[PDB]
Design a protein around this ligand. Structure first.
Ligand SMILES: CCNC(=O)c1noc(-c2cc(C(C)C)c(O)cc2O)c1-c1ccc(CN2CCOCC2)cc1
Ligand SMILES: [Mg+2]
Length: 209
């Protein structure tokens, strides 16, 4: 029921560097995830311009940020195009092998970790703040699937039994114990205002309690 896969070696190396390098500017993870959501929303919008039925799975195009201090999780939900099972296995819809090699080479030449998005592998900056990441996704052409990894060289993919999503992607960040600042409303607002001013979709920061 659950399939376990090994990361390509270059991606495992990148994840180990992200988890073990000293780097204080960890807030960039949220810019990268919101950017990915915006790109996926662009994709379903473009497909809908010639086939309106592709929005039968949901006409609203938005990004929601959902902190939960009890679970110590930050969840980012979008209603973009979503990923098929094959996309998930294929490094979450990215050419991550060649992106990670170029990025780690740039880091050798003095590049900064904040440039990770220029190399198409910004997703993995989630491991700056998260000990585990779950990605739940639904694409019009496939069933709902959950990808998960705590690094350590492997990820799992399984059919998702949770709340049906309609269409889109949910990223659940299981935060490290010393990274709970990213559950505070003021901190999230600050990061969104600083890094995501020109995202062309409504970003709703949920409140708690
Ligand atoms: C069939 C094609 N589907 C998609 O492109 C897609 N659907 O949902 C995507 C999301 C992926 C991520 C992470 C997990 C990679 C998100 O955080 C949010 C998404 O909406 C998502 C996606 C969005 C962005 C990226 C990363 N880019 C980066 C630049 O090069 C191309 C890939 C990869 C995948
Ligand atoms: Mg693009």
């Amino acid at each position: 029921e659950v399939e376990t896969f090994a990361f390509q070696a270059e991606i495992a190396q990148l994840m180990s560097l992200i988890i073990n390098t000293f780097y204080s500017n960890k807030e960039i993870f949220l810019r990268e995830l919101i950017s990915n959501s915006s790109d996926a929303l662009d994709k379903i919008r473009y497909e809908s311009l010639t086939d309106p039925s592709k929005l039968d799975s949901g006409k609203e195009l938005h990004i929601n940020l959902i902190p939960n201090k009890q679970d110590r999780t930050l969840t980012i939900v979008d209603t973009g195009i979503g990923m098929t099972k094959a996309d998930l296995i294929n490094n979450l819809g990215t050419i991550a092998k060649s992106g990670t090699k170029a990025f780690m080479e740039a880091l050798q030449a003095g590049a900064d970790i904040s440039m990770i998005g220029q190399f198409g592998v910004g997703f993995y900056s989630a491991y700056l703040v998260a000990e585990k990441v779950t990605v739940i996704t639904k694409h019009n052409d496939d069933e709902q699937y959950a990808w998960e990894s705590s690094a350590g060289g492997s990820f799992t993919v399984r059919t998702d039994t949770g709340e049906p999503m309609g269409r889109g992607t949910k990223v659940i960040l299981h935060l490290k114990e010393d990274q709970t600042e990213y559950l505070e409303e003021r901190r999230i607002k600050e990061i969104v205002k600083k890094h995501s001013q020109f995202i062309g979709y409504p970003i709703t920061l949920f409140v708690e309690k």
